[PDB]
Design a binder for these strands. Structure first.
Ligand SMILES: [Mg+2]
Ligand SMILES: [Mg+2]
Ligand SMILES: [Mg+2]
Ligand SMILES: [Mg+2]
Ligand SMILES: [Mg+2]
Ligand SMILES: [Mg+2]
Ligand SMILES: [Mg+2]
Ligand SMILES: [Mg+2]
Ligand SMILES: [Mg+2]
Ligand SMILES: [Mg+2]
Ligand SMILES: [Mg+2]
Ligand SMILES: [Mg+2]
Ligand SMILES: [Mg+2]
Ligand SMILES: [Mg+2]
Ligand SMILES: [Mg+2]
Lengths: 46, 63, 99
RNA sequence: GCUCGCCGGAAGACCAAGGGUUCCUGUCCAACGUUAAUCGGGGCAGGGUGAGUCGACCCCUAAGGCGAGGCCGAAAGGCGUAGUCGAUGGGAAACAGGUUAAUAUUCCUGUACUUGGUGUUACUGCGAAGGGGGGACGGAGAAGGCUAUGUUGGCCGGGCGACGGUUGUCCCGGUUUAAGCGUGUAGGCUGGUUUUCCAGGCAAAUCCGGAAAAUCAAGGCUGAGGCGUGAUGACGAGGCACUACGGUGCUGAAGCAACAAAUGCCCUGCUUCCAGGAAAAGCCUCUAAGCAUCAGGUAACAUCAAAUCGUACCCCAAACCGA
RNA sequence: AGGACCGAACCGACUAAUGUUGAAAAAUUAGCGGAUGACUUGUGGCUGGGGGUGAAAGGCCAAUCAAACCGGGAGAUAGCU
RNA sequence: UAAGGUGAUAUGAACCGUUAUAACCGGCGAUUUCCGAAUGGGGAAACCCAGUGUGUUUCGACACACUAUCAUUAACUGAAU
């Protein structure tokens, strides 16, 4: 049956992940702790 | 010849000083023949003076 | 002329893409990595004074880069401006250096 | 290559979503293909989707978002007026052949079209960020007419038959052909027209709204298809030469009628119902200044401009969601 | 017209078999219910964790739900193994 | 400072140098695209669109240059009164 996922790029920004991270103290914090702390190749947006 | 020479040439002619000399990068540098033995690399060994000229022109701005 | 503009450097760099040599029927054309803003007319004239060839028409467009690259995860685009521009027939590359 | 079998409201074809070169050519067969693999959606190369008319930009606005100042709120911040963004919707214009290993309403040929500036000519009130109209909009149902298109005949070309009959009553195939231009039809809708008067439309207005009169009617918009023209052209079964075996150059018959249809078109219609069905611009029109022999407006044509991005490459599936 | 009929698309899941190191972390096959409606679907938007949403099952809130995920207090505490 | 030298994974090509402006090192400069406080407005970051000035102008243009918001002061304008 409906397995909890259902992808949709557009629905992957302000609603979640993507570049929206650059709009909030914590949001932008995530990037630091993520990239810097333990260099991540990261990928977020595709 | 080249290198710091006529540094006062207000009657400057820096134009096409590059392309005309492009022989290497443009032509020669393709394969083999960009001076293989008698006189190879020139660009960074002398033709790199392109700055000196454009720099001067850039300086002779308050004319 | 009404060279008054920027005919100085509207054109630059070839392309030697797959389109190259494959795009030659009645008239070899070209590509040139033309500046982001050189328009068509200026391009038509650019190849006039220089290259000394006879241009029929120009076309051009844009093509955009794009890529992620960073100390962690950012990276961005690049931007360009292609430009076919046709020439003629009765006049080949003549004395020049192809590449 | 010849047989054989399977699907055919599809197991065919096209597109969207999503994918993101999987497309075509050459190559190579380690790994990947549940085996072999000279083969592939695998590897490595190249090629392949050039724009004034297709799309995005761009005008316009929907849901909603943001939001000068502003109202709130320990701070962060929430809400929201003007306003500004936001398509999945409205605004302008191109087709048919040809061609590349790969591009294509972008390149070539033939024939067009839109809009803006400038100019010449002619006629004229312009002339707004403004007023009015218009764009401009629901659901459901009931027809009629028509076209797509099919069938049969006629016409034209072709064959008379591995086995009994078919050598005119018969079997096979074709019988196509666009925008644009003229024609304003089946229908759809709505009375024209003139004059004068005004507490309305933020000011003005001949415009729209209201009021009176007066004279006629046979009007005025809208509109599918059909018919002429486009086109004694093209295409066209098929023959003839050349073949690289894929295909090429030339030539080229008939090319009509009758009936039958649509969920497509007239139909942003008609009828009816309650849940009573975007907006703004273009467009038409009316005036302001403001202009005041001017500028502008309309039309014809002459010319210049139409920038910049995208364009390469499965889709009920081996390219998407399921390792 | 209808808690009307069968009825494709479309939406849903009543039954059985198969699968159960699957083709598949819920499907395939044959049947099955709704199919002008409290219908169904594309795009985008709004509700945030003791909080949301809920024709109500503690259901759903990214294969996670009697209190999501990530990082931290953190080497929590563990008379237990 | 100096006989070499044109950064690295690879030469190679074509060359520059031996005396004292070739390299190479140090100081002061010149330049320094687009994004990013990003600041002309907008924006899914590296893209999109404008206003007002400029030079060369075959004198449409190209690019250029300025134009965010607050605070202090200055001068000028200036509502209901
Ligand atoms: Mg997007
Ligand atoms: Mg860390
Ligand atoms: Mg090409
Ligand atoms: Mg080609
Ligand atoms: Mg084996
Ligand atoms: Mg190669
Ligand atoms: Mg090749
Ligand atoms: Mg399937
Ligand atoms: Mg239900
Ligand atoms: Mg079966
Ligand atoms: Mg209930
Ligand atoms: Mg409930
Ligand atoms: Mg539970
Ligand atoms: Mg600047
Ligand atoms: Mg701001």
């Amino acid at each position: 049956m409906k397995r909890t996922f259902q992808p949709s790029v557009l629905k992957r920004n302000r609603s979640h992940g993507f570049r929206a991270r650059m709009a909030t103290k914590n949001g932008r914090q995530v990037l630091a702790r993520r990239r810097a702390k333990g260099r991540a190749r990261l990928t977020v947006s595709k | 010849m080249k290198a710091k020479e006529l540094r006062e040439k207000s009657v400057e002619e820096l134009n096409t000083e590059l392309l005309n000399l492009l022989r290497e990068q443009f032509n020669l540098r393709m394969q083999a023949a960009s001076g293989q033995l008698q006189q190879s690399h020139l660009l960074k060994q002398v033709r790199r003076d392109v700055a000196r000229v454009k720099t001067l022109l850039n300086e002779k701005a308050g004319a | 002329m009404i060279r008054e503009e920027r005919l100085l450097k509207v054109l630059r760099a070839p392309h030697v893409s797959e389109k190259a040599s494959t795009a030659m029927e009645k008239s070899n054309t070209i590509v040139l990595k033309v500046a982001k803003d050189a328009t068509k007319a200026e391009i038509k004239a650019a190849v006039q004074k220089l290259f000394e060839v006879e241009v029929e028409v120009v076309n051009t467009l844009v093509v955009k880069g794009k890529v992620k690259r960073h100390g962690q995860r950012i990276g961005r685009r690049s931007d360009w401006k292609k430009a076919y521009v046709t020439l003629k027939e009765g006049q080949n590359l003549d004395f020049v250096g192809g590449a």
